[PDB]
């Protein structure tokens, strides 16, 4: 389990973009997003840096928790 806080993920629709970004990178990933806390939980064989790099490129720079 890796977890990020995503300050820019400020609504449901940003959350969709975050989730689709991750799923396009790794179709086997599990992703949970919570707009109330701006927290994103990911299960993936990829590294936290690879996930973050993708999220950054999408305009949702995260901080790993």
PDB file of C-alpha atoms in Angstrom:
ATOM      1  CA  UNK A   1       0.000   0.000   0.000  1.00  0.00           C
ATOM      2  CA  UNK A   2       1.208   3.381  -1.041  1.00  0.00           C
ATOM      3  CA  UNK A   3      -0.615   6.561  -0.147  1.00  0.00           C
ATOM      4  CA  UNK A   4      -0.473  10.147  -1.441  1.00  0.00           C
ATOM      5  CA  UNK A   5      -1.937  13.485  -0.545  1.00  0.00           C
ATOM      6  CA  UNK A   6      -2.929  15.433  -3.621  1.00  0.00           C
ATOM      7  CA  UNK A   7      -3.581  19.068  -2.871  1.00  0.00           C
ATOM      8  CA  UNK A   8      -4.999  19.770  -6.327  1.00  0.00           C
ATOM      9  CA  UNK A   9      -7.521  16.923  -6.107  1.00  0.00           C
ATOM     10  CA  UNK A  10     -10.259  19.152  -4.835  1.00  0.00           C
ATOM     11  CA  UNK A  11     -13.404  17.532  -6.157  1.00  0.00           C
ATOM     12  CA  UNK A  12     -14.886  14.322  -7.503  1.00  0.00           C
ATOM     13  CA  UNK A  13     -13.870  15.207 -11.080  1.00  0.00           C
ATOM     14  CA  UNK A  14     -10.186  15.758 -10.270  1.00  0.00           C
ATOM     15  CA  UNK A  15     -10.393  12.400  -8.464  1.00  0.00           C
ATOM     16  CA  UNK A  16     -11.581  10.775 -11.714  1.00  0.00           C
ATOM     17  CA  UNK A  17      -8.642  12.177 -13.543  1.00  0.00           C
ATOM     18  CA  UNK A  18      -6.296  10.892 -10.847  1.00  0.00           C
ATOM     19  CA  UNK A  19      -7.897   7.459 -10.893  1.00  0.00           C
ATOM     20  CA  UNK A  20      -7.942   7.144 -14.681  1.00  0.00           C
ATOM     21  CA  UNK A  21      -4.339   8.303 -14.874  1.00  0.00           C
ATOM     22  CA  UNK A  22      -3.209   5.557 -12.539  1.00  0.00           C
ATOM     23  CA  UNK A  23      -5.352   2.880 -14.232  1.00  0.00           C
ATOM     24  CA  UNK A  24      -3.988   3.775 -17.633  1.00  0.00           C
ATOM     25  CA  UNK A  25      -0.450   3.358 -16.263  1.00  0.00           C
ATOM     26  CA  UNK A  26      -1.291   0.016 -14.547  1.00  0.00           C
ATOM     27  CA  UNK A  27      -4.628  -1.642 -15.451  1.00  0.00           C
ATOM     28  CA  UNK A  28      -4.126  -4.024 -12.518  1.00  0.00           C
ATOM     29  CA  UNK A  29      -3.852  -1.224  -9.963  1.00  0.00           C
ATOM     30  CA  UNK A  30      -6.387  -0.668  -7.162  1.00  0.00           C
ATOM     31  CA  UNK A  31      -7.005   3.019  -6.457  1.00  0.00           C
ATOM     32  CA  UNK A  32      -9.094   4.705  -3.771  1.00  0.00           C
ATOM     33  CA  UNK A  33      -9.579   8.495  -3.711  1.00  0.00           C
ATOM     34  CA  UNK A  34     -11.260  10.635  -1.080  1.00  0.00           C
ATOM     35  CA  UNK A  35     -12.099  14.189  -1.990  1.00  0.00           C
ATOM     36  CA  UNK A  36     -12.686  15.111   1.674  1.00  0.00           C
ATOM     37  CA  UNK A  37      -9.103  14.310   2.632  1.00  0.00           C
ATOM     38  CA  UNK A  38      -7.451  14.576  -0.784  1.00  0.00           C
ATOM     39  CA  UNK A  39      -5.881  11.204  -0.005  1.00  0.00           C
ATOM     40  CA  UNK A  40      -5.216   8.560  -2.647  1.00  0.00           C
ATOM     41  CA  UNK A  41      -4.452   4.930  -1.844  1.00  0.00           C
ATOM     42  CA  UNK A  42      -2.796   2.774  -4.475  1.00  0.00           C
ATOM     43  CA  UNK A  43      -1.968  -0.877  -4.830  1.00  0.00           C
ATOM     44  CA  UNK A  44       0.398  -1.422  -7.684  1.00  0.00           C
ATOM     45  CA  UNK A  45       3.546  -3.339  -8.614  1.00  0.00           C
ATOM     46  CA  UNK A  46       4.962   0.013  -9.827  1.00  0.00           C
ATOM     47  CA  UNK A  47       6.987   2.288  -7.674  1.00  0.00           C
ATOM     48  CA  UNK A  48       5.660   5.290  -5.777  1.00  0.00           C
ATOM     49  CA  UNK A  49       7.930   7.438  -7.981  1.00  0.00           C
ATOM     50  CA  UNK A  50       6.483   6.067 -11.217  1.00  0.00           C
ATOM     51  CA  UNK A  51       2.961   6.674  -9.934  1.00  0.00           C
ATOM     52  CA  UNK A  52       3.850  10.165  -8.734  1.00  0.00           C
ATOM     53  CA  UNK A  53       5.648  10.989 -12.004  1.00  0.00           C
ATOM     54  CA  UNK A  54       2.441  10.173 -13.925  1.00  0.00           C
ATOM     55  CA  UNK A  55       0.250  12.138 -11.493  1.00  0.00           C
ATOM     56  CA  UNK A  56       2.608  15.139 -11.793  1.00  0.00           C
ATOM     57  CA  UNK A  57       2.463  15.059 -15.586  1.00  0.00           C
ATOM     58  CA  UNK A  58      -1.357  15.091 -15.315  1.00  0.00           C
ATOM     59  CA  UNK A  59      -1.238  18.246 -13.157  1.00  0.00           C
ATOM     60  CA  UNK A  60      -1.825  16.478  -9.798  1.00  0.00           C
ATOM     61  CA  UNK A  61       1.572  16.625  -8.062  1.00  0.00           C
ATOM     62  CA  UNK A  62       1.305  14.341  -4.963  1.00  0.00           C
ATOM     63  CA  UNK A  63       3.137  13.978  -1.683  1.00  0.00           C
ATOM     64  CA  UNK A  64       3.780  10.390  -0.574  1.00  0.00           C
ATOM     65  CA  UNK A  65       2.579   9.496   2.954  1.00  0.00           C
TER      66      UNK A  65
END
